[PDB]
A paper describes a structure:
Strikingly, MakMvan displays a novel N-terminal domain, unique to maltokinases and conserved in the bifunctional TreS-[name] proteins, and without sequence similarity to other known proteins. MakMvan used ATP as the favourite phosphate donor, being strictly dependent on divalent cations, with a clear preference for Mg2+.
The protein displays an elongated concave-shaped structure that can be divided into two half-lobes with a central narrow acidic channel (~9 Å-wide and 30 Å-long), delineated by a positively charged surface patch on the N-terminal lobe and a negatively charged region on the C-terminal lobe, and displaying basic character at its exit site. The N-terminal lobe can be divided into two subdomains: a cap N-terminal subdomain comprising the first 88 amino acid residues (blue) and an intermediate subdomain composed of an anti-parallel β-sheet flanked by two helices (green). The C-terminal lobe is mostly α-helical (dark red). Analysis of the B-factor distribution reveals that the cap subdomain has the highest values for the atomic temperature factors and the C-terminal domain the lowest, suggesting that the N-terminal lobe, in particular the cap region, is more dynamic. In the structure of free MakMvan the largest pocket identified (pocket 1) is located to the left of the exposed catalytic cleft and delineated by strictly conserved residues within the C-terminal lobe (dark blue spheres). However, considering the overall higher conservation of pocket 1 in MakMvan three-dimensional structure, which is topologically equivalent to the substrate-binding region in other ELKs, this cavity most likely represents the maltose-binding site.
Author numbering: 2 to 452
The structure:
């Protein structure tokens, strides 16, 4: 008996949105220590839907200084008197205990922990909660590993754990290597699995691709595009193609028709959010319909790839965060898709990294368009370098199937336009300019005029 409902609604990882909660009750309580409980908490809404959250509770018989407001869940009487319930993920000892359960591949009631074979976990290292992690809770152990504990939990195979495991077990170096994970069942022993968390190698001294790209795209007086960031873009292309190759080998490839109806439905929806799109919708639809019946090769992919999802360590580019297409249910997130769609996601990301500058300037600051010209030249240079690096590993240039590639870029830009129109109108010119450019790129490719 803790007032879970009163506490959870204030948490940044709580996704109740505006909704009235009917109840918030533990579905399963699993003791880990005499003062540590693992809880699956079911929150029920007025429409009858239930959303499950994972909580770990540290009990204290007296107020413990280290915990702040967000980590204080409530109070209850126990067998030795009054107790305060804290969010145990903010307790270094409790976080270390979870890491030790992973290390041992322990089974505690219906909780199953597993250490990846041959992995070493930093049981000695100081645990610190990462403030950057928003949707889940992450605890970084020294400079060696990160424990990510899922907050909202759902049944089925977790794609981030699944694909990271495939990549690590195959020896692919372009990941933050999976070191362990843990899970439970959805409705007691013998029912659907429910992933609970993961442990990955942590890279100190890394840089986010988006930060490196934007720094390059902002260098003053850089009218002659430089080779240093092109070299990085090439190495990034190598890494993405290497990840795709490992995934294709492990999880297979297959053929499907280009998904004309799906991209048309996205276009129809987007055009409702962004009226600017109506003027382009007929042209977009024509290009998509030219792909009706086109067979495409599909495989397991990253699914939400952009420069925010890649890290440069001193030695390599890594891809992270394989949960898949945002907003989609788990089954959909595990569908195979074209590797060219992941390539398209990086190309869109280059466009934003260069053109963010322009939407933030006053018109008078680029009256003759010379900074816009530089942005275009920078995107072209680094897109070519990325595709070339991809080709060097894949043995096939993504630009070869240029029609399919451009159609995926176009579908992303249509979706971006709807987003910017709703949430950031000043950024709308970025995907609108892309749509007109890509319409020509795609028309050229559909006629086999691309290089
Ligand atoms: Mg991410």
């Amino acid at each position: 008996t803790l007032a879970f409902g009163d506490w959870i609604v204030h948490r940044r990882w709580y996704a109740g949105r505006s909704r009235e909660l009917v109840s918030a009750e533990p579905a399963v309580v699993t003791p880990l220590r005499d003062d540590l409980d693992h809880i699956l908490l079911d929150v029920t809404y007025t429409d009858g839907t239930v959303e499950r959250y994972q909580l770990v509770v540290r009990w204290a018989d007296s107020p413990v200084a280290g915990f702040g407001e967000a980590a204080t869940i409530g109070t209850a009487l126990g067998p030795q008197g009054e107790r305060i319930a804290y969010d145990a993920l903010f307790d270094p000892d409790a976080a270390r205990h979870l890491l030790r359960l992973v290390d041992a591949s322990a089974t505690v009631a219906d909780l199953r922990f597993t250490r990846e074979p041959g992995a070493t976990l930093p049981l000695y290292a100081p645990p610190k909660v990462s403030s950057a992690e928003q949707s889940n809770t992450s605890v970084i152990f020294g400079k060696d590993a990160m424990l990510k504990v899922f907050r909202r939990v759902t049944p089925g195979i977790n794609p981030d754990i699944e694909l990271n495991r495939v990549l690590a077990q195959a020896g692919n170096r372009h990941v933050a290597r999976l070191l362990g994970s843990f899970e439970t069942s959805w409705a007691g022993p013998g029912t659907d699995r429910c992933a609970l968390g993961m442990v990955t190698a942590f890279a100190a001294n890394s840089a986010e691709g988006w930060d490196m790209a934007t720094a390059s795209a902002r260098e003053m007086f850089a009218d002659v595009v430089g080779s240093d960031f092109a070299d990085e873009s090439y190495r990034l292309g190598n890494a993405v193609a290497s990840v795709h190759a490992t995934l294709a080998e492990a999880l297979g490839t297959s053929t499907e028709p280009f998904p004309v109806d799906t991209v048309l439905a996205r276009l129809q929806s987007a055009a409702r959010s962004a009226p600017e799109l109506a003027g382009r919708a007929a042209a977009v639809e024509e290009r998509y319909r030219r792909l009706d019946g086109r067979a495409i090769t599909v495989q397991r992919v990253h699914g939400d790839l952009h420069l925010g999802q890649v890290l440069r360590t001193p030695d390599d580019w890594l891809l992270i965060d394989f949960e898949g297409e945002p907003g989609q249910p788990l089954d959909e997130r595990r569908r195979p898709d074209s590797p060219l769609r992941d390539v398209a996601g990086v190309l869109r990301s280059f466009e934003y990294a260069a053109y963010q500058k322009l939407v933030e300037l006053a018109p008078e600051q680029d009256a003759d368009g010379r900074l816009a010209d530089r942005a275009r030249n920078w995107v072209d240079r680094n897109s070519a370098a990325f595709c070339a690096g991809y080709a060097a590993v894949a043995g096939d240039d993504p630009r070869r199937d240029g029609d399919v590639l451009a159609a995926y870029e176009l579908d992303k830009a249509v979706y971006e336009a709807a987003y910017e129109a709703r949430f950031r109108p000043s950024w709308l010119p970025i995907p609108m300019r892309s749509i007109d450019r890509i319409l020509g790129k795609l028309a050229a490719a559909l006629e086999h005029h691309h290089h």
